[PDB]
Structures are given as C-alpha cells and as structure tokens.
Amino acid sequence: FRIVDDVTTFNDKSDPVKAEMAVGEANDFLVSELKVQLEDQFIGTRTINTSASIIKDFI
C-alpha cells in the first residue's frame, strides 16, 4: 500500500502552498523560524552603521 498524494482539502491547485502539505509545511517552518530568530537577535540592539551589513550576513 502507498499514499497517492498529500493533497489538502483546499482544491485550488493553482496555489501549491495551500494545496500541498509539503510545500506549505516548508513555508510555515521557514517563515516561523525566521520570525523568532530575528526578534531575539536584532530587536533591542543599536542601529549602528554596520547594522544593515550584519543583518544581511545573518540572512
């Protein structure tokens, strides 16, 4: 036995993020992890001249 597909209830296949669990799963973890890491790192720090370069290197 095997699973034919992991399609979600949302039938609009034009949006693979909503339609496909795997694609949406990667988007959620990518977005969520980036959200948490940036807050702990950069919020509350001084807006030094090299702040933009440091943020780019972190990304």
Binding site: N49, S51, A52, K56
Partner: protein
Amino acid sequence: QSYLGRKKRDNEIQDFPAEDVQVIVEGNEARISMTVYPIRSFKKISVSLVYKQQTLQA
C-alpha cells in the same frame, strides 16, 4: 602697521585692516586714523542641534 602687527602676534587684538590705516600731515598736527577689531572673551555659546534621518543599504 608694525605696532598693530605685534599686538596681533601677541593676541592682544583680533585683527586690523592695513588698508584703512590713513595718515594725514599738515603743519604741526599729524592726523591719524585706524581701524582695529578688539579682542573679546567668550561668554555665551549657542548650539543648534538638528536631528535627521539616514537610510542604510547593503
């Protein structure tokens, strides 16, 4: 001019214009006219601090 130059050298005066120094001699009298910028001591310092935005890139 030499006398005023020494004063400027010793910082006893601020500056003087050499051109405006005019001397008129007529008989016994000898009229002299000169301009001198006097030396002054600081007693008030005004600072106009202005804050502005700056945009960073890269």
